[PDB]
Each structure stands twice: as C-alpha cells, then as structure tokens.
Amino acid sequence: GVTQEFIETTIQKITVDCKQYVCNGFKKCEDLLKEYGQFCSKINQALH
C-alpha cells in the first residue's frame, strides 16, 4: 500500500512597494501618510 503525503516547504515570496501601493506616487497622499510614522520602512523590513 502506498500512502501519499504532501509537506510544503516554501511559500511565494512577496515584496510590496509600500509607498506606491498606498499612495500611487501622489505627493499629497505621501504628505498625509508621513503622519503615520515609519510604516513603509517597517513593512519593507518585515517582508525582507
């Protein structure tokens, strides 16, 4: 008898351009987002 088993070893690695994802390259949006702290850098570091 053959028992088949799948054990995953990877997931798809995703890096997100936080600035472009949130603001789409708009200066007003970037100025408004800067009030939220260092969100994009922390997101980049976490994903990396």
Place this chain on the structure above:
Amino acid sequence: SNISLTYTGLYPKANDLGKQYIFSDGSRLFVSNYSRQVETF
C-alpha cells in the same frame, strides 16, 4: 536624536557643483559680470 527619518523638503541635489562666485580686491575696482547675470529664485 539618534534616529534616521525621511524628510521631504527643500534640499540640494547630491554631488551638486553649484555656481562659483569669485571676488577680487582693488583705485578702479575689478568685478565680473555678476551684476548683469539674473538667476532664477
């Protein structure tokens, strides 16, 4: 203090040579074309 922040503002470009202005000393004075050169603020 002891923190790196991203700032958006009025800053010079990196490795910018800029414009150099040289002044001399004199009777009749010696000057360049600076007074007739109008730059853009």
